[PDB]
Scaffold this motif. Structure first.
Motif, PDB file in Angstrom:
ATOM      1  N   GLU A 180       0.809  -1.209   0.000  1.00 16.92           N
ATOM      2  CA  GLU A 180       0.000   0.000   0.000  1.00 16.92           C
ATOM      3  C   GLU A 180       0.840   1.256   0.000  1.00 16.92           C
ATOM      4  OE1 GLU A 180      -2.875   1.337  -0.624  1.00 16.92           O
ATOM      5  OE2 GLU A 180      -3.053  -0.717  -1.423  1.00 16.92           O
ATOM      6  N   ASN A 181       2.118   1.161   0.341  1.00 17.17           N
ATOM      7  CA  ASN A 181       2.974   2.334   0.352  1.00 17.17           C
ATOM      8  C   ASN A 181       4.043   2.265  -0.724  1.00 17.17           C
ATOM      9  OD1 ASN A 181       2.184   4.043   2.960  1.00 17.17           O
ATOM     10  ND2 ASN A 181       1.851   1.853   3.326  1.00 17.17           N
ATOM     11  N   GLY A 182       3.851   1.393  -1.702  1.00 15.56           N
ATOM     12  CA  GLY A 182       4.687   1.372  -2.874  1.00 15.56           C
ATOM     13  C   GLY A 182       5.819   0.379  -2.852  1.00 15.56           C
ATOM     14  N   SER A 213       3.616   5.226  -7.709  1.00 19.68           N
ATOM     15  CA  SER A 213       2.579   5.985  -8.392  1.00 19.68           C
ATOM     16  C   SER A 213       1.202   5.512  -7.970  1.00 19.68           C
ATOM     17  CB  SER A 213       2.689   5.860  -9.910  1.00 19.68           C
ATOM     18  OG  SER A 213       1.629   6.559 -10.555  1.00 19.68           O
ATOM     19  N   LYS A 214       0.321   6.471  -7.802  1.00 23.49           N
ATOM     20  CA  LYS A 214      -1.045   6.243  -7.396  1.00 23.49           C
ATOM     21  C   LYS A 214      -2.003   6.358  -8.576  1.00 23.49           C
ATOM     22  CE  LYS A 214       0.736  10.200  -7.750  1.00 23.49           C
ATOM     23  NZ  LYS A 214       2.172  10.522  -8.062  1.00 23.49           N
ATOM     24  N   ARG A 270       0.974   5.228 -14.811  1.00 22.43           N
ATOM     25  CA  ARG A 270       2.078   5.088 -13.865  1.00 22.43           C
ATOM     26  C   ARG A 270       3.432   5.073 -14.580  1.00 22.43           C
ATOM     27  NH1 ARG A 270      -1.754   1.434 -11.778  1.00 22.43           N
ATOM     28  NH2 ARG A 270      -0.541  -0.368 -12.546  1.00 22.43           N
TER      29      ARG A 270
END
Ligand code: SF4
Ligand code: SF4
Ligand code: SF4
Ligand code: SF4
Lengths: 460, 460, 460, 460
Positions: free
Chosen positions: C117-119, D138-139, D146
């Motif tokens: 979730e945080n990359g 990237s979100k 992305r």
């Protein structure tokens, strides 16, 4: 095939490996080395594959000694070869001997049957085991006298190197069918090789050809010619110059580079055609094509590029990509070919199947015309002297006409090198060469059904 | 070494591979197979290493056919072996033949010198090439008559399997020194093997021993005994039961398991000592140790564990760890040994160097006492009949006393199996066994200086 | 799986290789080593296969340095494994670190999803990459504080060794599920290993267990316990004693030899039967069978012989030989079995397919009765703590009754080790062991869908 | 290095293997493939060595699927490379992705430090792992958004191919430093490759360049350009035409054959010398030398012959032969050189050590004069954009003058290609090319200390 020998060097196995590498083109199916230890034992290591695939630094390390012979082997069993034991080694009443041979004994089956009648067994079907058998039944002394006794019973081609507990001897058959040359290193080291390029690599200065009918022997005393066996006008294989040897080589006293360049020139004078480009089938026909381009007055361009990473055992797509074997080693330069009239030079045409593939490849690349030029006369008869050619009915110049081969491979024109102009170029030495594959007339004729010297060590 | 033959099975090479695997203990230095193609050619593939290292599924695929023999070889050249060409194949006036041999020709040098005097050459120094030479100079017909002719000149041990274009023949020498047994598969397939365990694996039901002096030949007609050559009182190798064969085997009609178990029992009755544990040196002496433990009335414990992953070539720390070779395959269970009086059972003592290492290993592991018990009489003379032992002065029972060996290896007591009680256990068949390595008296005596069959295909 | 670490020895890679060899039984699918060069770089070499197949002397030569960790890896991908990168190495803000892990993170998917979730990206799906990720997001200093931070988020089993540019640290999870032990060489060298047998081989004297919840770190100063994380009553895996470790080992402070011997004794008291022989399924059940034989008062006999040359990738005949996989490694001694009533001892029964094969093999060998005795309670639940067992419905004790398994495998009687008598034998330490595979009640319960730690480095 | 991608072909792994073979010149140190199974898992196999040394038919068989990317890698670690894990694969919140990259991220250390500050770990020091990290944080959605997000943070050169569970996307950086081209097979199959020659081999018709700044994505719908990122005036690497690509290639829209031929022509007009022969240093400078020979009006001759069997690891005599590395792959034709004035053409001079060896080789072969002609301007600055050159002080044109290099390598004259005439030949497109290695002025300047992408998967 190719042979090598070194006497008088503490790195005999390593230098033999290097010279075999320099001769790798002569045979890719097998390799082997025999070296004499300081305790006078013949250590031998021998395998299927390239010289580098057969010999590791670990294995060269198991071959110490001052004397070594080496062989590099061609075989139509290709990579499906089960065993290779050449250079052949054996023991007999007078000690131990190994031999490496390049050639073909025309009278092998008669010699073998006569030896079989007195209880001889044969581990392999190779000529070199027959040579050792003949030496062994000889009652003469010294060793070279037994070599002489044995060679007088052999019909055919042979360039051989023998190694014993303390001698290295080179033999060239009286016709001189097969190249053999001698050179010397900085130290006393004496080396024999099938071509001068192997001498050049390991810095053995070229001294002279081994002469047709010669039995040179080198030992502690030095190099001494101890027999110049009776020999007629020579019959050195012209195909060494046409195809088999490297351009850096000087085989039979001539520059192979100059032979192929002149062949190209002859093709251009005697069968010219309007064209925009002259290209080669690489890497063989580059030299001839250069010469063709010179006489024709149109520039040579590297229209096909040989791949550096050819393997000879390669994967192919399931969905068919036709002619993948050639496309995997020849890449056309569309810029050089698109819309042009192309003269493509090549060294021979035996089967004719691959020339068709090459023409198609050039046409797909945008060639407007494809004029084929073969830097050799038409090959009509089989070689009986130690390099494998298909049977006489499998040779496309036996079945088809020149115009017929032109139609079959699909090119606009097709021209071979004239046999008569080849003999003219040789001039004085035109009598010194075997041409049986262009004429059909053999200098030494087969006494019964005959074989190609190398098959497999698989027993009938 | 070990031999295998199969007649009448479309998977002859695969089944030969499996049986050679089942005999791998008989020889780890080399392996090889010869199979008869449907076109009656003898295809052979042969190499240095284990059966699995020599044969891949790719290579078994190159050996189609209905008949095959296979050999697995021992050699003191170990992994430094240069060439292995056994099973040996050759061609001669009556066709093609291959042979796999287990034994030793006592009169090899005389046979070879006489053959050399008439011009024979020798590719290898192995006995099996001499056998083929002798067959070849025979003028008799059929093939088995030439086998008979050849065997009448051989002194020594031999169990052989021959393969030809359509026959498989088994030969056992008149003394029966070496095991050879026959079995039948579900289909008609007939197999010969050095030990019954190879038969058991590939589900060829054990039928009978090949008899001393027998020449069995199987062809299209079936299995037929075509010679029971004259043969003295048997002299079957007792070391097959002491050491060389597997406990599942029934060699010479006896259960090897029962032989070794009884040997252990004899050791316990005739040389007891106060002890807390009975252990073995694995996996050889486990069976004997079990028997010892039974008679002594103290429990067997697996005090040493053989490693599953022994490699025979292995790295060692540069800061020397002593005895790393044994520590890399034998691990002591300290719980079983600490503070205990240990009786450790083993199958023999020849050089005596490793017994010392094992005693030291047990002491370092906490053993209070180490009583050694050898499930064999003292080995004083060299084997002249096909399994390599060092020379007679290298045998520790030739130099030292029993008490002297006890001191040298560093144990509290030391006891060998009494030769006389061994003969008593054999009883009726005590006359049917060679004991030359325990007595010094050979049933067949060497006619001159003599050799061990394995060597290496490296030529003097 | 198995882990190893060495600090303070100039032969760290070689000693790591040897200890990995001594632990090879823990995992055969992969191996790898990470060693710190004198210039403080982490050199790593890692592959699929055995320790000897992965590491040559040439490759050990590319790993100089004083510190090294090593991992040996189990995987149900077997020989079809594509990639293995364990021990895992990575670089992050505080330098470079490698880790080798034995165990299973029950909360892997939750930890990975939260990191994703945080990359975070994941090169492999292994727990050890999650451990490194957690260390990396820690903001504490020094390194062991980040290890502590990371471990507090891990649920499950873990015995790990970490290596950095100048430290070697060992971690054992608070339950102590997995063995880890420490020893010292003659020089200062400190080693950690999954079992004491690896210490024994390279002469590192066993000092103590690494304690549940401990974070030991060794550097220039020496060995120092820098965290004894909160940990409850232990839950050490009983299957280490039942099956997974070697008899020479002392795992969890107990002699594995004594555990298995006592298990055999318990089987003999609590489920006796009239029999003539007691035998084992080798090599696992020999020790237990010895104990059974002791209590039962009938002699142990080596009725089956494990083959030394098992390969795990083996050819099989085309015409079907049934159960060839077992027949290729287990050979029955007909002399020991024919007509006898056999009690055969073995260490467990999971799938039940191979027990049937073994019973059939014994019957074909002449056994009159076959009484099976399992030196372990019935296995009903899957292991959630780092050794692969099939799913719960694939465990034959989940589907069938004891009498039902008896019928399915085809033996006259069948008896498992009573769970209650196992706990009685442990006595005081009965509370210190995980038994989830015998009960179904897990000390640490899975928070969501959960995995076996090792699959493949093949990405979903 | 070189990259390949295929979408929409049931033989994706095989075709990728073939295209990597066709690009093997771009990188010999490593190879790898990633293929999407029918179940949407990314199977990857990756190793050190050539494409043929890394991939067997057995291993291609383990990569079924419709989508695959492939990478072929250059590394100054040569054959001493420990690990190669490219194409890089990872898993993250939006699934699984692999990438193959050719180029160099100028700002790698800053990007990595910023990612490290938030807890990222790095398995390798390669740029492609940084790209995956950036995509992962990237979100945005979808995947190409992305990719766009990630590329906006990258300074430097990159041509990349990405593979996901159902998409293949190609990316070319806004300057277009590195070639990338697209082609189509007979079925719908879409392929991307570093050079057109890979397209040509597997019969994917060349369609167009991937444009600088383009993000092409192909899926079930087809090929769609989904981003043409903002991009300055192009700076395509001129060294692709000078040295790095094959003559059959059309890189950056130009025929590499025509570029090199014209370079040779320019050398002949602008720096002529009396000479008898024009030769090349093979096989690189053959094309340029042809052009030189054309303008100079003296014939080209193949005065040096490259050996077909170059090994890159090779044995050497212990009694040193000087310059054995070159003598093992270049053989002079003495007939062409003896007594002649030779103009020898070559593609560049960086270190200058091998040019000296070649001049010496030509002189020893009988050359009277040796005039060197370099088909490239002098190389003074290091490449910062993805092909390894030594540091700026190691470049001989940084230390020495043209006349000084002439003296150092030992030739009679020495001439480089004029930079200004190169720009004139390019003409309209002279603004579209990076020349930093000839000028020193970089289009993208390094933000801090910077690296070469290849390295080795060995961790600091
Ligand atoms: S027949 Fe042809 S190949 Fe044979 S030796 Fe004569 S010229 Fe050469
Ligand atoms: S001497 Fe010994 S080893 Fe040799 S055959 Fe006789 S009993 Fe066997
Ligand atoms: S579930 Fe079974 S195998 Fe797993 S840790 Fe517990 S006792 Fe061991
Ligand atoms: S610096 Fe030179 S080698 Fe590097 S990208 Fe620019 S032109 Fe090419």
């Amino acid at each position: 095939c190719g042979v090598v020998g070194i006497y008088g060097d503490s790195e005999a196995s390593r230098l033999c490996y290097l010279a075999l590498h320099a001769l790798q083109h002569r045979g890719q199916e097998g390799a082997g080395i025999v070296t004499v230890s300081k305790d006078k034992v013949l250590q031998t290591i021998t395998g299927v594959g390239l010289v580098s695939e057969v010999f590791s630094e670990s294995k060269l390390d198991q071959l110490p000694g001052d004397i070594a012979i080496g062989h590099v082997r061609y075989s139509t069993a290709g990579s499906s070869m089960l065993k290779n034991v050449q250079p052949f080694v054996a023991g007999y009443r007078f000690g131990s001997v190994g031999v490496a041979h390049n050639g073909n004994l025309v009278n092998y089956t008669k010699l073998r049957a006569d030896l079989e009648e007195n209880g001889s067994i044969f581990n392999t079907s190779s000529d070199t085991e027959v040579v050792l058998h003949l030496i062994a039944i000889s009652k003469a002394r010294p060793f070279f006298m037994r070599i002489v006794d044995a060679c007088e019973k052999l019909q055919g081609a042979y360039s051989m190197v023998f190694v014993t507990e303390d001698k290295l001897v080179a033999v060239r058959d009286p016709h001189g069918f097969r190249p053999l040359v001698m050179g010397r290193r900085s130290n006393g080291a004496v080396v024999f090789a099938s071509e001068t390029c192997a001498l050049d690599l390991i810095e053995a200065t070229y001294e002279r050809e081994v002469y047709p009918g010669e039995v040179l022997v080198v030992d502690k005393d030095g190099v001494k010619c101890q027999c110049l066996m009776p020999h007629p006008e020579p019959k050195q294989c012209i195909f060494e110059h046409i195809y088999f040897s490297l351009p850096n080589s000087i085989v039979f006293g001539r520059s192979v580079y100059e032979s192929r360049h002149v062949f190209g020139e002859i093709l251009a004078t005697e069968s010219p055609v309007d064209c925009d480009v002259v290209i080669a089938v690489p890497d063989s026909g580059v030299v001839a094509a250069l010469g063709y381009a010179a006489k024709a007055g149109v520039a040579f361009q590297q229209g096909l590029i040989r791949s550096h990473y050819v393997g000879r055992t390669f994967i192919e797509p399931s969905q068919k990509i036709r002619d993948f074997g050639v496309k995997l080693k020849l890449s056309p330069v569309r810029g050089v070919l698109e819309g042009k009239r192309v003269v493509v030079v090549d060294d021979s045409i035996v089967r004719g199947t691959t020339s068709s593939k090459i023409v198609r490849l050039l046409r797909e690349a945008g060639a407007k015309e494809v004029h084929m030029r073969i830097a050799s006369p038409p090959i009509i008869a089989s070689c009986y002297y130690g390099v494998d050619t298909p049977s006489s009915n499998e040779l496309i110049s036996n079945r088809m006409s020149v115009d017929e081969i032109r139609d079959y491979i699909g090119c606009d024109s097709l021209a071979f090198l004239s046999f008569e102009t080849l003999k003219k170029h040789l001039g004085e030495d035109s009598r010194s060469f075997c041409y049986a594959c262009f004429t059909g007339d053999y200098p030494v004729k087969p006494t019964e059904d005959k074989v190609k010297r190398g098959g497999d060590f698989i027993d009938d």
